[PDB]
Amino acid sequence: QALKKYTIDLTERAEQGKLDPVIGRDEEIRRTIQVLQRRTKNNPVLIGEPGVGKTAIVEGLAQRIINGEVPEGLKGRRVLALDMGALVAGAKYRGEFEERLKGVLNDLAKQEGNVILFIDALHTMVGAGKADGAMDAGNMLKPALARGELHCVGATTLDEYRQYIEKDAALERRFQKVFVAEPSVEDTIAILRGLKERYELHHHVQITDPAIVAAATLSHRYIADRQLPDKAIDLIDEAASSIRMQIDSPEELDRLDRRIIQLKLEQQALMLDMLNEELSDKERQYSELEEEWKAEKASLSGTQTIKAELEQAKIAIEQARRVGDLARMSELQYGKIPELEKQLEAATQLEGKTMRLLRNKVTDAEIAEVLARWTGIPVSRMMESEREKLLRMEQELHHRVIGQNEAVDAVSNAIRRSRAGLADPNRPIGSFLFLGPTGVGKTELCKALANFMFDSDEAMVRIDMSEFMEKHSVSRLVGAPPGYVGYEEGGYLTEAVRRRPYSVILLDAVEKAHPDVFNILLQVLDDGRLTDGQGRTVDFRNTVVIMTSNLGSDLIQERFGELDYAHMKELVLGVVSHNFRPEFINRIDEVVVFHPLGEQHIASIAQIQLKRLYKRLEERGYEIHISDEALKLLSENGYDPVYGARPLKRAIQQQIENPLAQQILSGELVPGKVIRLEVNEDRIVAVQH
Amino acid sequence: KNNPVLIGEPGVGKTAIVEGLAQRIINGEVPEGLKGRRVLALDMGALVAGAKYRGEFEERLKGVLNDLAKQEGNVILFIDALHTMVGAGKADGAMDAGNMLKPALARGELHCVGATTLDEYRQYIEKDAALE
Amino acid sequence: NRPIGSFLFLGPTGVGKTELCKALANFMFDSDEAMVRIDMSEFMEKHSVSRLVGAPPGYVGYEEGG
Amino acid sequence: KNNPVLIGEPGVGKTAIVEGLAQRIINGEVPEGLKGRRVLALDMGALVAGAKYRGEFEERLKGVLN
Amino acid sequence: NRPIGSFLFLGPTGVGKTELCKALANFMFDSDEAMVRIDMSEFMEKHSVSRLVGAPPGYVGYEEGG
């Protein structure tokens, strides 16, 4: 019988317990039991959006059958899963597919409703194994499908269902539409409790249960990509594996092992010494660490073996519930369960004493770490280097950004709420509109946030918005709707977020676009969703969006004195109210005002530019000092209220590099002489002394 | 879900990271849980090339899968060009490579290693949702 | 012949329009997004009707519908 | 990465540049790592003789590579 | 960070401005026909910026650039 030769018996492997406990679903397993128990068309097919446990639902059916938890008409059945590739495989000669298929269908006749045939990925079968001289594998079954001479259980994803089945609506209507829902939070909680049991059966470790519900909350919030429950199961399994590998080798033991083999090589190179004594001491310390590590490993191993014995007792009492020995039930219960559980908990609290360099649990820090290396949103809890670097926020702004205290304050606040957890899970982390006259930081703070947060300058998704003076120009940030030109490669943006979803997005020069470009940003700054043409969504609730204009520049140069910051903000708010739409800036957290620069700012700026100048001339092979009087000249050179800091830059560039490189490619300057930029009478001389 | 896939802008040596993993195995510098393992590279083209008959590609692939069952979790199989295996034997009304492997990876039963390019990831995989 | 009850909402924003519809969705269905929230700024131009209804047959937009 | 590509607007005879390379190989005007090579040309279209069957193209290409 | 020079020339007619930049090229690139001479007075209404950038996707000039 080729039913052996081309199937999987689920019912055996369910009785063998190689499958998984299936929780919930009693409506849906009920409705499947319904649609099997008809007269014509006994064929439900699971339409399920991908990964919500479709194969789990068919498995849960088969496990209830082996349990017998069902209506009577399904008691004693069989379910045989169908490898289509087994049906295709040997068909090198013509016609052999059809022989195998008709033979299996006649044996399905000859088993007389005992076997409920199962098909996963039913969109494979529609046009399977066909060629010109074929029967195309849809035609061969469809009369038996109509008359119910068959009990096909189907399971396919919605997208394949539309694309691949309903290209013949007859071979759609032969089946029955069985919709799987979305499993919710608490659904995921229950299912994770069951497979928590299962994954500790595998991975030899311990799981905190509030860590499980943390994993469910975080996975529902931070991965737009699969669906539940599969993502939270993924978080469980990867955090368990990270625990397992951190058990399998220790980091301080690795560093100390590098240390002791370094000292051993050094001593063997020496052959006063005392290096022998230092090697003996470090080997003793490493041996102590090793023996502790081994002993607590052995403690874990004993705990896990007795956990496994608990599981085998659970196996035996489920076998007794299947078979029905009577005193065996209470005997196995009252013997095996409570004493092994209490010394399991005694070994657990012995670990909770002894675990030192050494982890045994799955807590929320592990899930957070696996997430923050899984995507890159910084959710994991702080090292104190990170926390004081977040407290070295504003100082490291002022190593790039002189002055500018308002926006220093606000941006520090925003990134504090980013790491602090107090953020909205409904907005992006901060909406930001920036105002000031041209050149007092409106690019510079944003490059500084890249240089601080990501520790690199030009990685910040810089959609320069100069170009966008025409209402064309949305579709080069949200793609092009299908059949038009830019369908197969999307917009610039939705890539540039759904790649790396924690990234600062500058919209430079907001006011010089089309006036309503910015209703895209109405979507953004309300709710963080932004769906491009190709179907797909984008979350924005893990980025920071900053917008720069220069609207109140006349008013800023006007009334920078003689007002508080409150009326300044209010009056430039009136200005933007003249300019922007009242839908828009209501979605903004803070409009700041950049304030114009004084001269000590300019001195500091010129110093920083000299620092990068000395860096540039370093790889050239040249060191330079300055007269501070020459810096005072440049202070006199590079001041004007009207422009800010760029005239300093080009004035420095001219008045230094033109005589400098003039003398350089005068072929003059031997390296080594640290060049005083002492002054000329109005210029600055570069000297060789 | 025993299967990572490496994504980058291309060039940055994803094939190199797989080989350096392989060396750290051979060096015995990995943690113990995958010591002694095999790492073998899968060709698409070796599988496809002869099978101009019906179904022979599926038989090549299933025989390889049953060999991998026979080695019983000892061999870490590698596929470069994951987006090539998407449409690999994607023949006229037949089975591709994907809709054979789609049960054979979400049962843990294999340990494939992925190495794709992010634009071909978008081209060939996040169209095709189940494999993704 | 008709849908159940259609609505246009008015008034200056932030007075709980979108949030009212999300509250309906939290009621009836127990999610915010399990509802169809399509903001219209995707649709400022003539051509992007195909983002919602879709491409006519015989193109690339034939496998993801609408 | 032993494979550079030639580039421009056409009508410049890059074909002939490969030809003159081969002629210098004949004449031995090359460094001592190419004396004795085989400069052979192949069309991609040369292996599109029978492009219906599965892998036939690819079997040609792998046989070439072997 | 900034590109290398940036120069807004002022002068009356025919004082050699175009010829200055051509002499720069004929120094530097040994021709005048290695320069990007975007003739700017075509641009008298706004919306020919797509001549220089390209056309945004889902209009005509997406395969071609600006």
């Binding site: - | 008959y53 | 193109y59 690339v60 | 599965r54 | 209009y59």
Partner: peptide, 24 residues
């Protein structure tokens, strides 16, 4: 006595693009 086989004979479609071309 010689039998037969069954062949692939596989290829793809041909696609189109479509281009808006804005008025103002």
């Amino acid at each position: 006595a010689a039998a037969a086989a069954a062949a692939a004979a596989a290829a793809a479609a041909a696609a189109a693009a479509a281009a808006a071309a804005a008025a103002a």
